[PDB]
């Protein structure tokens, strides 16, 4: 099965294209490409500051006749200065302008942490710190579920929840929808496998980000842990035939995760999607794990004085 069941009834692709830091006269070819070759889902945000052009790809593959709406699967992120109950739907209407879209497959809140609304995506206060908001994440649930009753998208969800957070909107009051999702960092030096056991038990699907470790992310060094060059995963990937990111995209895959690896180079984004005719043992599957050092690309780490920052929380 190249799709998992939500706890919305729809099918989601288990494989999707990643876009942050994809710079935006690429990601347009790279979403064309992506779409030419397989695939169906498309991982987006507001604030990667790109869905413009990435529309323009969606759109002009539905107009070639490449595929159907029906067969698309767009999520995309509510960023942190919209969680007020009031900006919710403007927010997602602005996603969806970009999109050329009529509703989203998926909307995440991308972060538990609200931070003060306006033009500014992180918000400082004179000596650096980030500015929060005062609406709690049960108000934006709320204001999250009106979006699937209006239409505009048919799952929700969230993203960089740990457990407590998790657990207060499946302990909401009046809780109308659960969350179908939550999409964190996951890969074998980060393996999260308490938070993974707890949102599967719940029936929320976890999606793995960073699958490869973001080898492109600003000030990324080459003496930092490096996935992709790691020989032990080297040592699986020649085993089957496979490269190592190959590897490091059918791991989550096995473990029943939605992974979302991103490129923007066409030979890369059609390896990458060239995942669905081998198997990782056991044996393999249980190798990888061990690599788990706790090893964070994605921390947020200018929020760590902030009420909802969620990586103090061991999980
Ligand atoms: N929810 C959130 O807070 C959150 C956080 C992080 C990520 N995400 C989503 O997850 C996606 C994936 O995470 P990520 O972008 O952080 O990093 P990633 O997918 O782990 O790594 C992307 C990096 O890997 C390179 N790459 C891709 N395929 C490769 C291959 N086959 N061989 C060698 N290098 C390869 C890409 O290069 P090129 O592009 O140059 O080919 C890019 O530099 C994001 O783009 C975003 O959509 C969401
Ligand atoms: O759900 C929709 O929006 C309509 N379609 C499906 O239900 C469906 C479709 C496809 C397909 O187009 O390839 C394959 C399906 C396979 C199994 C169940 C529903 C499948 S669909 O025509 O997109
Ligand atoms: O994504 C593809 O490349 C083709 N498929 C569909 O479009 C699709 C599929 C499934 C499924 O396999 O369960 C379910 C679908 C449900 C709704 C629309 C398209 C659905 S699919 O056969 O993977
Ligand atoms: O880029 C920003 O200005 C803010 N965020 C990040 O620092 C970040 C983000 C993502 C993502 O949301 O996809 C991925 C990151 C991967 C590695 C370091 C910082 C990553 S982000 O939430 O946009």
């Given at each position: 099965?190249?799709?998992?069941?939500?706890?919305?009834?729809?099918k989601m692709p288990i494989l999707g294209l990643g876009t942050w830091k994809s710079?935006?006269?690429?990601?347009?070819?790279?979403?064309?490409?992506?779409?030419?070759?397989?695939?169906?889902?498309?991982?987006?945000?507001?604030?990667?500051?790109?869905?413009?052009?990435?529309?323009?790809?969606?759109?002009?593959?539905?107009?070639?006749?490449?595929?159907?709406?029906?067969?698309?699967?767009?999520?995309?992120?509510?960023?942190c200065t919209y969680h007020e109950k009031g900006l919710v739907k403007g927010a997602?209407?602005?996603?969806?302008?970009?999109?050329?879209?009529?509703?989203?497959?998926?909307?995440?809140?991308?972060?538990?942490?609200?931070?003060?609304?306006?033009?500014?995506?992180?918000?400082?206060?004179?000596?650096?710190?980030?500015?929060?908001?005062?609406?709690?994440?049960?108000?934006?649930?709320?204001?999250?579920?009106?979006?699937?009753?209006?239409?505009?998208?048919?799952?929700?969800?969230?993203?960089?929840?740990?457990?407590?957070?998790?657990?207060?909107?499946?302990?909401?009051?009046?809780?109308?929808?659960?969350?179908?999702?939550?999409?964190?960092?996951?890969?074998?030096?980060?393996?999260?496998?308490?938070?993974?056991?707890?949102?599967?038990?719940?029936?929320?699907?976890?999606?793995?980000?960073?699958?490869?470790?973001?080898?492109?992310?600003?000030?990324?060094?080459?003496?930092?842990?490096?996935?992709?060059?790691?020989?032990?995963?080297?040592?699986?990937?020649?085993?089957?035939?496979?490269?190592?990111?190959?590897?490091?995209?059918?791991?989550?895959?096995?473990?029943?995760?939605?992974?979302?690896?991103?490129?923007?180079?066409?030979?890369?984004?059609?390896?990458?999607?060239?995942?669905?005719?081998?198997?990782?043992?056991?044996?393999?599957?249980?190798?990888?794990?061990?690599?788990?050092?706790?090893?964070?690309?994605?921390?947020?780490?200018?929020?760590?004085?902030?009420?909802?920052?969620?990586?103090?929380?061991?999980?």
């Open positions: 099965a190249s799709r998992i069941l939500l706890n919305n009834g729809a710079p935006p006269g690429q990601v347009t070819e790279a979403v064309k490409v992506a779409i030419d070759v397989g695939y169906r889902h498309i991982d987006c945000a507001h604030v990667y500051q790109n869905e413009n052009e990435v529309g323009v790809a969606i759109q002009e593959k539905l107009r070639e006749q490449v595929v159907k709406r029906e067969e698309l699967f767009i999520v995309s992120k509510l960023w997602c209407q602005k996603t969806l302008s970009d999109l050329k879209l009529d509703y989203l497959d998926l909307y995440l809140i991308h972060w538990p942490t609200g931070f003060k609304p306006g033009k500014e995506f992180f918000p400082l206060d004179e000596s650096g710190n980030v500015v929060p908001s005062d609406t709690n994440i049960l108000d934006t649930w709320a204001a999250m579920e009106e979006l699937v009753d209006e239409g505009l998208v048919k799952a929700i969800g969230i993203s960089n929840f740990n457990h407590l957070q998790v657990e207060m909107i499946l302990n909401k009051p009046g809780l109308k929808y659960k969350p179908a999702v939550n999409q964190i960092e996951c890969h074998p030096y980060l393996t999260q496998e308490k938070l993974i056991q707890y949102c599967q038990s719940k029936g929320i699907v976890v999606t793995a980000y960073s699958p490869l470790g973001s080898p492109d992310r600003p000030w990324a060094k080459p003496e930092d842990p490096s996935l992709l060059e790691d020989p032990r995963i080297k040592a699986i990937a020649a085993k089957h035939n496979k490269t190592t990111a190959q590897v490091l995209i059918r791991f989550p895959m096995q473990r029943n995760l939605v992974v979302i690896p991103k490129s923007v180079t066409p030979e890369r984004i059609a390896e990458n999607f060239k995942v669905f005719d081998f198997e990782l043992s056991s044996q393999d599957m249980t190798t990888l794990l061990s690599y788990n050092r706790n090893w964070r690309v994605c921390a947020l780490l200018s929020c760590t004085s902030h009420k909802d920052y969620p990586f103090h929380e061991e999980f």
